[PDB]
Amino acid sequence: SASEFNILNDGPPKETYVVDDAGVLSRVTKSDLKKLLSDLEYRKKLRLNFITVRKLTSKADAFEYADQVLEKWYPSIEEGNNKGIVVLITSQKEGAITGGPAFIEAVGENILDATVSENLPVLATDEKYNEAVYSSAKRLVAAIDGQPDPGGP
Ligand SMILES: [Ca+2]
C-alpha cells in the first residue's frame, strides 16, 4: 500500500516522534507526545517513535512491519541500538513494539508485552487512539525510568 511504503520511505520522524499515517491523533496529543519523548531522548538517550497505520496490505502482522521499519530506518546497530518503534494498526486494533537492544533492555519484556496486549488494543478498540498512544508512551517511559508501573487501562 501507499501507506506502508511512505512510512518506510520517509525515514524516521526526527523533529516529531510520531508518524500518524492513519490520522487518528490530534495536534494537541502529538505535541504532548513530542514533549514527553523529546524529554526521554534528552535524559536517557533513547528515541521512541510511534507509527499509526490503518491496515497492512502486505500480509505482515504488526511486529513484522515494526521490525521492517526498524531495519529500514536504522540500518546498523550504531543507529538502532537506542531506538524503539511502536506500531498501531488501527483497523485491526493490533500493536507491536520492537527496537534495538539497549531500548529493549531498558523497558524490559514484561512492560513491552503488557503495553501491546493491554494499552494499545484495548484503547484503540474503543476508538481512544490518543489515549492508546499517549498512555503507552507514559507506560514505556515509566519502565525506562524505573518508576512504578502505571498499569494497563
Ligand atoms: Ca494509514
From Swiss-Prot:
Asked if the record carries the keyword Cell inner membrane, the reply is: no
Which processes are annotated in GO (biological process)?
A: photosystem II repair
GO CC term (a single one): chloroplast thylakoid membrane
Q: What are the record keywords, sorted?
A: Chloroplast, Membrane, Plastid, Thylakoid, Transit peptide, Transmembrane, Transmembrane helix
UniProt membrane topology term:
Single-pass membrane protein
Gene Ontology MF terms in the entry: acid phosphatase activity; mRNA binding
Cellular compartments annotated: Plastid, Chloroplast thylakoid membrane
Which family does the record assign? Belongs to the UPF0603 family.
Name-wise, this protein is UPF0603 protein At1g54780, chloroplastic
